[PDB]
Every structure is written in C-alpha cells, then in structure tokens.
C-alpha cells in the first residue's frame, strides 16, 4: 500500500503530538514536586518563627501592664513613706517643746 | 508520491525539534518562577528573624525592668516599716510627756 504508508505517517504524527503534550505535563508536575521539596523546610521554619513572634508580642503586652501596676504600687508606697517621715519630724518638734516644759 | 512521503518525514523531524525547544523553554520559565518564589520566602524568613531579635531584646528589657521594680518596691516597703516603728516610738514618748504636762 503506497498511500497506506502515507496514512501511517499521518497517524504517527497525531500520536507524536499526544505524547509531546503528555511529556510536557509530566515535566511540569515533576518540577512542581521538586519545588515543594525545595521550600518545605523553609515554609515550616517560617510558620514556627511567626508563631514564636506572636507569642513574644503577647508576652510583651503582659509585661507592659505588669510594669504599669508596679510603678503605680511603688508611687503609692513612696508617698506613704514621705507622709511618715514628715510625721516623725512633727513628733520630734512636739517632743522637744514638751521636754523643755518638764525639764 | 515519494516527495510527499519525504515531506512527512521532514515534518516529523521538525516537530521533534519544536517539542524539544518547548520542553526546554517550559523548564527555564518554571525555574525563573520558582527562583522568584524562593527569594520571596528567604526574604520573609530574614524579616521574621529580625522581628524575633527585636522581640527578644524587648523581652529582656521588660523583664529586667520588672525585676528592678520589684526589688526597688521591697526596699521602700522595708524602709517604710522602719519609719513606722520610729513614729510608734515617738508617739509613745509624746504620750508620756503629754501626761506629765497636760
């Protein structure tokens, strides 16, 4: 068959186009898989570092409110100390005047 | 008839050349995209590392400030207790002198 040999070549060319498309799709899939393996460890270390940062930022806010409570507590005690020291001065002054009137 | 056959074999050789150029071009394009993505991930990683360094430094500063405040507060509470006992002693002296006087 002279034309049967020609029809065989046209059949072959259609089959070769199908094979090309399959090989082009397979190369894409293989490259995406290699890519995922390349970024896997880095994506995991990134998510871990974001969560550690979220926890630290949360801890920092708690630390600020603790500092605020401590400063206000300290200011109250420093003022109380001031009014007790002045009470001592007042009492020393009173004691001296009373002591001169007996002695 | 034979020239038409030689034309089909010439065409098939050309289709193979094209498929090969296309296979290479898809790989190069994917590599550019993947390299771009890797650079973005690496950049985000370096900014999370810098944010973590900054947070760890703030955590040290906050915690050390808390530690200093608690120790300062204990010192003042202790000094207050001493002064309060001095007031009690002076009020006792004031009461004994006041009874001898008025």
Numbering used by the authors:
A (entry chain A): -1 to 101
B (entry chain B): 0 to 101
How do the authors describe this structure?
Recombinantly produced fragments of the corresponding coiled-coil domains were folded, as judged by thermal denaturation experiments monitored by circular dichroism (CD) spectroscopy, and formed dimers in solution size exclusion chromatography–multiangle light scattering (SEC-MALS) assays. We succeeded in crystalizing a fragment of the coiled-coil domain from each species, with different boundaries, but spanning approximately the middle one-third of this protein region (henceforth, CrSAS-6_CCMiddle, DrSAS-6_CCMiddle, and HsSAS-6_CCMiddle; see Figure S2A for the protein sequence alignment, Table 1 for a list of recombinant protein constructs, and Figure S1A for SDS-PAGE analysis of these constructs). As the HsSAS-6_CCMiddle and DrSAS-6_CCMiddle fragments did not originally include methionine residues, one or two amino acids, respectively, were mutated to methionine to allow SeMet incorporation. All three SAS-6 structures revealed two-stranded parallel coiled-coil domains as analyzed by SOCKET, in agreement with the predicted nature of this protein section. The HsSAS-6_CCMiddle coiled coil is distorted compared with a canonical CC structure at a region N-terminal to the site of SeMet incorporation (indicated). Only parallel associations between coiled-coil domains are compatible with the stacking of SAS-6 rings into a continuous cartwheel, whereas antiparallel coiled-coil interactions would lead to horizontal displacement of SAS-6 rings, a distribution incompatible with a stacked rings configuration. Both the HsSAS-6_CCMiddle and DrSAS-6_CCMiddle crystal structures revealed primarily antiparallel associations between their coiled coils, with only much smaller parallel associations between coiled-coil copies, which were offset by approximately one-half length or the full length of the crystallographic c-axis, respectively.
